[PDB]
Amino acid sequence: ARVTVQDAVEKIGNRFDLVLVAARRARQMQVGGKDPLVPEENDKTTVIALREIEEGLINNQILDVRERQEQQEQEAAEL
Amino acid sequence: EIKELLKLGDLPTSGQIRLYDGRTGEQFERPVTVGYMYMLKLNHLVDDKMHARSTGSYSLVTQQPLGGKAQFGGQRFGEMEVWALEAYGAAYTLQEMLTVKSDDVNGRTKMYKNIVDGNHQMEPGMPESFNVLLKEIRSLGINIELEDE
Amino acid sequence: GQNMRVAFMPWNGYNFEDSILVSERVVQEDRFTTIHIQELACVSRDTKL
Amino acid sequence: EEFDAIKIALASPDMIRSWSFGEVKKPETINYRTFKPERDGLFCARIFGPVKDYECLCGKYKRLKHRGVICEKCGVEVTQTKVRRERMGHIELASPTAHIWFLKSLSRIGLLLDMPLRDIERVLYFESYVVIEGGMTNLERQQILTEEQYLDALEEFGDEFDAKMGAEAIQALLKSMDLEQECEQLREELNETNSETKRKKLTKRIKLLEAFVQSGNKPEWMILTVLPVLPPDLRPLVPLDGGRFATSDLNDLYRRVINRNNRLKRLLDLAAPDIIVRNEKRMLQEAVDALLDNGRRGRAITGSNKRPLKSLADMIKGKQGRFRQNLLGKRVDYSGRSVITVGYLRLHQCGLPKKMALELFKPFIYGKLELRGLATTIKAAKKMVEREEAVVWDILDEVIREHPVLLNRAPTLHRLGIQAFEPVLIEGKAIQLHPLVCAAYNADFDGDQMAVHVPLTLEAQLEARALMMSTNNILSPANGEPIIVPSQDVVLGLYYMTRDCVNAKGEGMVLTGPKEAERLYRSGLASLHARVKVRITEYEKDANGELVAKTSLKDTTVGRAILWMIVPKGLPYSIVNQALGKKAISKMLNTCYRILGLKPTVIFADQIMYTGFAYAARSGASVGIDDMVIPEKKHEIISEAEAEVAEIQEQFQSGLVTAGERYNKVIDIWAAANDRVSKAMMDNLQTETVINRDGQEEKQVSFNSIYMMADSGARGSAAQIRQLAGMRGLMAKPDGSIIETPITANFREGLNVLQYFISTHGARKGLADTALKTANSGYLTRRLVDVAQDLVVTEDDCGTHEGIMMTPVIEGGDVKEPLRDRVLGRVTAEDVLKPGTADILVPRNTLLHEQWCDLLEENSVDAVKVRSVVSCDTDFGVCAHCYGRDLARGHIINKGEAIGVIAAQSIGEPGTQLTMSSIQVKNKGSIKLSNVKSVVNSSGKLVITSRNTELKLIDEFGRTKESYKVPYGAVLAKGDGEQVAGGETVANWDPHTMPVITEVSGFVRFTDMIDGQTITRQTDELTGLSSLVVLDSAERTAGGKDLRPALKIVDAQGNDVLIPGTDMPAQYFLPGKAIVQLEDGVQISSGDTLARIPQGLPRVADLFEARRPKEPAILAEISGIVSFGKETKGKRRLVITPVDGSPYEEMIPKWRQLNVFEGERVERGDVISDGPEAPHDILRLRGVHAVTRYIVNEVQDVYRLQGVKINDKHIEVIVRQMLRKATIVNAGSSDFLEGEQVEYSRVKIANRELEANGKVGATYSRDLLGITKASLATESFISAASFQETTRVLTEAAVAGKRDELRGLKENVIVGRLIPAGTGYAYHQDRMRRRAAG
Amino acid sequence: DIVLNPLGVPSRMNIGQILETHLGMAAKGIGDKINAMLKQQQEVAKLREF
Secondary structure, X not given: OOOOOHHHHHHHOOOHHHHHHHHHHHHHHHOOOOOOOOOOOOOOHHHHHHHHHHOOOOOOXXXXXXXXXXXXXXXXXXX | OHHHHHHHOOOOOOOEEOOEOOOOOOEOOOOEEEEEEEEOOOOOOOOOOOXXXXXXXXXXXXXXXXXXXXXOOOOEEOHHHHHHHHHHOOHHHHHHHHOOOOOOHHHHHHHHHXXXXXXXXXXXXXXXXXXXXXXXXXXXXXXXXXXXO | OXXXXXXXXXXXXXXXXXXXXXXXXXXXXXXXXXXXXXXXXXXXXXXXX | OOEEEEEEEEOOHHHHHHHEEEEOOOOOOOOOOOOOOOOOOOOOHHHHOOOOOOEOOOOOOEOOOOOOOEOOOOOOEOOOOHHHHOOEEEEEEEEEEEOOHHHHOOOOOHHHHOOOHHHHHHHHOOOOEEEEEEOOOOOOOOOEEOHHHHHHHHHHOOOOEEEEOOHHHHHHHHHHOOHHHHHHHHHHHHOOOOOHHHHHHHXXXXXXXXXXXXXXXXXXXXXXXXXXXXXXXXXXXXXXXOOOEEEOHHHHHHHHHHHHHHHHHHHHHOOOOHHHHHHHHHHHHHHHHHHHOOOOOOOOOEOOOOOEOOOOOOOOOOOOOHHHHHHHOEEOOOEEEEEEEEOXXXXXXXXXXXXXXXXXXXXXXXXXXXHOOOXXXXXXXXXXXXXXXXXXXXXXXXXXXXXXXXXXXXOOOOHHHEEEEXXXXXXXXXEEEOHHHHHHHOOOOOOOEEEEEOOOOHHHHHHHHHHHEOOOOOEOOOOOOEOOOOOOHHHXXXXXXXXXXXXXXXXXXXXXXXXXXXXXXXXOOOOOOOOEEEEEEEEEOOOOOOOEEEEEEEXXXXXXXXXXXXXXXXXXXXXXXXOOOHHHHHHHHHHHHHHOOOHHHHHHHHHHHHHHHHHHHHHOOOOOOOOOOOOOOHHHHHHHHHHHHHHHHHHHHHOOOOHHHHHHXXXXXXXXXXXXXHHHHHHHHHOOOEEOXXXXXXXXXXXXXXXXXXXXXXXXXXXXXXXXXXXXXXXEOOOOOEOOOOOOOOOOOOOOHHHHHHHHHHHHHHHHHHHHHHHHHHHHHHHHHHHOOOOEEEEOOOOOOOOEEEOOOOOOOOOOOOHHHHOOOOEEOOOOEOOOOOOEOOOOOOEOOHHHHHHHHHOOOOOEEEEOOOOOOOOOOEEHHHOOEOOOOOOEOOOOOEHHHHHHHHHHHHHOOOOOOEEEEOOOEEEEEEOOOEEEOOOOOEEEOOOOOEEEEEOOOOOEEEEEEOOOOOEEOOOOOOEEOOOEEEEEOOOOEEXXXXXXXXXXXOOOOOEOOOEEOOOOOOOOOOOOEEOOOOOOOOOOOOOOOEEEOOOOOOOOOOOOOOOOOOEEEOOOOEEEOOOOOOOEOOOEOOEEEEOOHHHHHHHHHOOOOOOOOOEOOOOEEEEEOOXXXXXXXXXXXXXXXXXXXXXXXXXXXEOOOOOOEEOOOOEOEXXXXXXXXXXXXXXXXXXXXXXXXXXXHHHHHOOOOOOOHHHHHHHHHHOOXXXXXXXXXXXXXXXXXXXXXXXHHHHHOOOOOOOOOOOEEEEOOOHHHHHHOOOOHHHHHOOOOHHHHHHHHHHHOOEEOOOOHHHHHHHOXXXXXXXXXXXXXXXXXXXXXX | OEEEOHHHOOOOOOOHHHHHHHHHXXXXXXXXXXXXXXXXXXXXXXXXXX
């Protein structure tokens, strides 16, 4: 979670992937401005992602569907 | 002679006395040796060794930060610590330590700019220390190129 | 240097590995205050401009 | 922008003119009144670019109104000044000159031209001609020519022939040659003569010709015709503050070469005498030679300061070159330094001074303060941070939070020298460091510095939080033991408070919990060491992850009860119910890690740290003069030793004892006196406490302060107390010998002047050794880390065949490391089975964690075959299953982790610490003989007639416990398979006499020994039982030396007694120094003899160097009968006659004792001559598993001597990286015997034996190189050029025209990309996927 | 006014600091007695004798 990263790996399956997925989350968590699904509780942007993958709401399989539905509805709006 | 001198001064022969803690105020379990010792103040001060550098001067030939507190130089990230980082597996920390810290003329400036804008995004670049090596080898009489895709 | 009381006892880990625990009293009476003299030079030259 | 590879080759005048933006013609650099560079000089504006960005020299076009026009007044293109760093220039040389790299580096034009370097040098210096071609048969191409015979040829033929002087002669020679003709001719004539002395040189000639043919490098380009110039900013002439100037020596070298080139150009049109033109051409050659490499060909050219000018090859090579000083190791930004002080701090925090924090993060405060809208502009924010208002601190305290910061302590011996800590802001000037990490840092608070680095991007902070945090680093990567063990104060406090006293206070009272124990101790009603009965509720997880509670009443001390409030509800109370020293604390923390996890482990470590500090302070411990007790028997022992010193001196002056025996006796008596003194002092120090409780007297463990800090292992040892109180033993003078007079005094009593002077010798010796040998240790670590760059785990299971055997270390003496820890963490290779047949625990692969180790040790298994790195079949890396579980984590290692670097660091870290007749059974067991040629002596016992036999001790379980060595011709007092106890001398043999005992019994008549030619008549003067004596070649007559004197066994009828069961005749040959014991006519029985024949850090760094020992043990690569042929011609020859195969003739030394004789039979890979074994021979004869075992054992011996434990998988990975080259014996796809990487041979034969082809591929042979040779011989020249011998590797790369796929870690580090390890592995796999699909 | 680690003595083997500490204690004790009897000014003769 905040001091250790033990239960993240079981949700992830690897250690070197947790940094990648956490950075990928924090990217649009900080510059995208989208509300984190884990609460705030006075934390930083790089650790709320770690807590979210601690409770394991997001996964790489589902990390790539909500970003394609949004663009497809964008193009539907354009056309 | 030490024992006789301590006896003369009305002091314990063993040379240790009981002390009481200043915080809680109870006697320590065992007698503690206390006396007068000649301390020395050495020239290794702390403010003379205190140093820190965010962004300052850069060397001329190789475009890397200088060294030394006197000229406001950055710390040397030697090759042993590079070995340690690549042993950890932290490739991104190494990449920033080799490119946007010292030898990316257009890399460090934009890293500054986007850090000020609150976006800690990385934009790699070709280190200048490699460009000087390429120009040096190329000027030695042996062709060196990069096989682009 | 100077000479003052000294006790050989571990104190809450503040002398963990050759560290020294020092007083406020020794600071109050300036038993180790030192004076340093520095010289700074300003040079005026005749540039072509 | 993005590229794939780096291409290196030679450069001809074509693209070397293409690079240039102009040609320099003037030696002038810059004007002296103004400071604008002159036209077509070394700093010209047209050639290299404008001095000021977007501004010409005049000013007709400026201010971006014109983008890149060329000012017609001057000719400088208006653009940036950055381009001035990349613009090139060229110099047209009047006479061609020779490149030095392809002239002096060994020769690269000597091989191409086949002519020696001496002749090339003679021609180049204008001393001798060479015939380019000759139309007559008298002269011949490539023939040297002196001036006199040149004139003779001129007056004889004139224009028919052609000879020339100078570098143009070499250029003409290179133009004349055609590579195809040599290619087709040398290869066709190679196979006629198998002269191995020339096979290598013609093979390398063929290889060079192939390289030139398919590399596209025309050999004319080797001789320089046009020379490039470096861009001006890379050789800057910049003004200094005091109106002075500074420039690189490259400006001097360029000025010299172009001055001489212009002078040569002027001389040519002057029609000057040929000697002056030749002198000028030679001067140009020397000037260019010095420019490319100053001190290489002749004398080094010095500047005005009498120091050699550095060439442009001097500043890319060596320690100070670009590779090591500017590419691998780089200055860094966002960093600071400060002294190190102690912390109350938590394990994941570091104390960062507030004054440094605002400086390090300054852009972060700028950005955050702009975001808060507090200052309108960034310059306003700079003003605020310059005023240090309260707002900047109110921003800092939340800028730093959750932002990890790295801490570095040079030298970083291992991976733990860099750790990431969560900063906490402190009012001060020094870095506060958590004491628990000091051991990993190898840092003490005696003025040591600390380097601080702040990661910037999200990826860097996340990596610091996930991998670099001190909480993550608990176990060392070298081996599984933890690295956060409390060092000195914590252990002293815990040891002090986990004690007992006989009548201390409140003894025997019964308490209902640890809480009231603590309240009792605090109130002062109970002592800290008091045997009390405490009701203790402990927890156990016998259930499937559930904790069960059992409440029991136990007798213990108050301090042990107080500890129980710290143990984290998962450990037995028996782990706290002892004295709790250093080893106990380490093992209890390890158990807390293995049972509970990580978070309980770090919480526990911090809590025991806090309690240890607090109770060490509460206790109060000091060192005083009275604490160092002195035995009352010290002076008695000294006087008693001096008594025999005097008696030995009087015996020496009597003359009945010589110097050596007197020396040994006095050394022995002084050592005995020292041991007696130490025993007395320990006896007086360990239980000096005599106290009484409701009785008469009872003796307990001492509470002496020095004993408290020695027993607990906090500081010092029992060996330090000996010289603290007893005598200071013996010391040695610098020559090595030991002074006989000891330091009878100690430090409590002080030392004489003489004693102090004597001790200073050893003090200085040790200090110099420490100051010296760690440089070699660092060099060794760098060499080790160089070869193991590319070791990154790539697959999970390569699915390889059998791996390597594993056996304990029972050999020599007692068992040092059992099978329990030598296989912990490995993966099996076969279905290893329990001693009960058909009982299998592993399906050919499993992780041998603790449960499997317990199951194995419960059974009587002694041999397990595990999967090793050397056996891995993965190409370009290793698979995870062939490695084993990670040691820093304990689970199976995951893909992408760089194992070579951690291996090299782990085995290079302890380099500093390692600066320096009869057989008796010990325990009950079975006397087992392995590979024994048994025979019965005359006394009915069992005697041995072989050298390949070993003594084994087998217990009732079956596993071997003790191993011993028995030589050939020894006598055993017991038979095979005898159940006996220890303490019995079983084997007896003469260490000097080597017998030739005959296995058969029969009549012994003197055969084939004729006196006067091979033997001499010598009889014993006391016994009378003597026979003819056989001496060596140097002592026997050469007349009978043609035949070796053989004493065969005969019978009454006179026929040879053959081997029982075999038709081979049985006869014995007598080498030198063989005196026959029995006389003629008498016979011997079985087992009786015929004749009696009388008889550190570099130590490990040489193993990785694969150094050949001075006296290697020569072995045989094929079985059969060994014989001898040629005799006494420089050195004796040996003949091998196998049953059906060939003859083998090799070289053997006759002055070294052998193992077999003319009539004996030996097998492949057996010892014939004694001596240290060469690793190359071990690889050649026996398998790679044997050499890996040999290297691993020999290295591990050095570390076990110093008590340093390193996992064996960190040695065999480097050994695996050693075995990367291969030599081919067959053909089909490559040359006849060229060297080639083994994995390339595997991928070659991966289709020649697959369906792609029936059988064309060639078979290879494994080849072992030293660590340095292995490092330099790599397919990527960037890795090699950044290590050592940069000039040689760059020359080889240039001629061969190699390219790098940028696979290694160091290559990407140099280029600046992501390293292919960890996260970079996940990036490079995607890159490979993109490249594969196009 | 200074607290020092006792553990730094034995392994480091610099015992002279303990003897120096005992001498310092003795010397300061003599000085304290002299100063105490000087504050009262018993007699010049008594000071001379001590």
